[PDB]
């Protein structure tokens, strides 16, 4: 959609690039909300209305084709990100799910480079990504996410998408969702927005999930028909890594009887371990809390390969069929090597209550506990804070 006249004021976020020899050196980044989270309205001199909701093509009246859509639908800048529950403070990003005044912005943001006109492209195969988190205000059924998508570096800036990454265009993920704009262009044919997606962190105070998701396409792929479905071009489920799913129940939770005590802050380390040829083989997750390294659990479950890392053997074993079929750990590594955009969000699940994250085989949460009607009784204002985003050499990102 065409940029409007309102000023876009991106929050500044200091991050780090890490080496063994040089330590953690600070870098300037900016934060941008998803393009379709910006106010989108019909152009000056057109009757008021919308340019499409999540799940829909754009409207036939103002968007019969890409060129009409590009002039009739206006994306306004957001001059005050706090109205959408997005604030930064030095090296800290705070995402508020619900504001004090009752609004539910459920924000999703991307990391821009210091120009504000191109995503920071992370190339993590053979490297580590680390962050500090406060998960205390995330009950059952909340998802705090920190992940990568294979979005176009400029948000697919183009003649009819002049806004680009500066307005957060070009979002995609392994769900192949229909959005009224894809690559900042009217999705006239109502296709899905597919790409490789690496879920570094999907967690609340009750459960922690890591999951790579493969697609058999490079970059953002516009899917039609069966391509968007479970047997299509992307892996919707991913290869899930969660202590609970591998029958380890005392690793992560609220209080001193868990190794990672989600009542206090902690650090999350993710290593992308490659072979001599630069192909990804293992994803290693471990934590640091109160100045001490908490090594990963080993799997503890009959029929599951005994491992402390994600790899092809574990993924095949645990039923991740589309993950293996659409490129497996090597394919995921190739997307990570091409470069990905960092996305950070907070959301809840009216339909499923996020049961796949923290319920049953995945955690300690009862049926219905994760329903939004119950979340607000446990925590009226859910929020997450990510602090000191930092990536670089294996073993360089953490102290003690
Ligand atoms: C920034 O964070 C620190 C907590 O470290 C707090 O002292 C400070 O008041 C915060 N700044 C703003 C503007 O909220
Ligand atoms: C699950 O965990 C406990 C180990 O504490 C063990 O008794 C049980 O056999 C394990 N179950 C499976 C299905 O591996």
Query: What ranges do the domains of the chain cover?
Result: 2-392
As annotated, the active-site residues are 197, 202
| CA 97 to ligand 2 centroid distance, Å | 37
Closest CA to 21 of 393, 293, 389, 273: 393
In ligand 2, the atom with minimum distance to the C-alpha of 300 is 14
Residues framing ligand 2 (Cβ under 6 A): 247, 300-302
Asked how this structure was determined, the answer is: X-ray
Nearest CA owner, ligand 2 atom 14: 301
Q: Tokens 């997307």 belong to which residue?
A: 335
| CA 285 to ligand 2 centroid distance, Å | 22
Nearest CA owner, ligand 2 atom 2: 247
Q: Name the resolution in angstroms.
A: 1.9
CA–CA distances in Å: residue 273 to residues 124, 190, 294, 373, 398? 9, 38, 18, 41, 17
| CA 207 to ligand 2 centroid distance, Å | 19
Rounded CA-CA distance 143/155 in Å is 25
CA–CA distances in Å: residue 366 to residues 202, 206, 245, 295, 361? 19, 11, 16, 28, 11
Closest CA to 144 of 56, 36, 266: 266
Rounded CA-CA distance 161/169 in Å is 8
What sign has the CA pseudo-torsion 64, 65, 71, 75? positive
Nearest CA owner, ligand 2 atom 11: 301
Pocket test of ligand 2: the residue of 245, 247, 297 to mutate, having most ligand atoms within 8 Å of its CB, is 247
Architecture category of domain 2-392 in CATH: Distorted Sandwich (2.70)
CB 191 within 8 A of CB 214: no
3-state DSSP assignment of residue 3? strand
């Amino acid at each position: 959609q065409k940029p409007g006249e309102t000023k876009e004021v991106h929050p500044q976020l200091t991050t780090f690039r890490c080496t063994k020899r040089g330590g953690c050196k600070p870098a300037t980044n900016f934060i941008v909300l998803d393009s379709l989270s910006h106010p989108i309205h019909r152009a000056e001199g057109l009757g008021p209305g919308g340019c499409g909701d999540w799940g829909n093509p754009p409207p036939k009246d103002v968007c019969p084709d890409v060129e009409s859509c590009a002039k009739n639908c206006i994306m306004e800048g957001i001059p005050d990100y706090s109205q959408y529950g997005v604030t930064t403070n030095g090296t800290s990003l705070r995402l508020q799910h619900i504001l004090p005044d009752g609004r539910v912005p459920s924000p999703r943001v991307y990391l821009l480079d210091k120009t504000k006109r191109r995503y920071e492209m992370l190339h993590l195969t053979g490297f580590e990504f680390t962050f500090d988190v406060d998960a205390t205000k995330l009950p059952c059924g909340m998802n705090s996410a920190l992940y990568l998508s294979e979005m176009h570096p400029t948000g697919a800036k183009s003649k009819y998408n002049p806004g680009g990454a500066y307005y957060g265009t070009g979002y995609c993920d392994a769900q192949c969702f229909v959005t009224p704009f894809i690559n900042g262009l009217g999705n006239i044919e109502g296709k899905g927005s597919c790409c490789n997606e690496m879920d570094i962190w999907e967690a609340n105070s009750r459960a922690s999930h890591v999951a790579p998701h493969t697609c058999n396409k490079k970059g953002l792929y516009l899917c039609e028909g069966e391509e968007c479905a479970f047997e299509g071009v992307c892996d919707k489920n991913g290869c899930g890594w969660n202590n609970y799913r591998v029958n380890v129940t005392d690793y992560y939770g609220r209080g001193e009887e868990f190794k990672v005590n989600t009542l206090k802050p902690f650090t999350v380390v993710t290593q992308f371990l490659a072979n001599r040829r630069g192909k990804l083989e293992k994803i290693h997750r471990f934590y640091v809390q109160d100045g001490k390294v908490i090594e990963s659990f080993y799997t503890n479950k009959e029929g599951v390969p005994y491992t402390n890392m994600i790899d092809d053997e574990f993924c095949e074993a645990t039923g991740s069929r589309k993950y293996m079929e659409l490129g497996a750990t090597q394919g995921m590594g190739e997307a990570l090597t091409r470069g990905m955009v960092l996305a950070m969000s907070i959301w809840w699940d009216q339909g499923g209550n996020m049961e796949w994250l923290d319920h049953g085989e995945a955690g300690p949460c009862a049926k219905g506990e994760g329903a939004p009607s119950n979340i607000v009784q446990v925590e009226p204002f859910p929020e997450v804070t990510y602090t000191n985003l930092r990536w670089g050499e294996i073993g360089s990102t953490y102290q003690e």
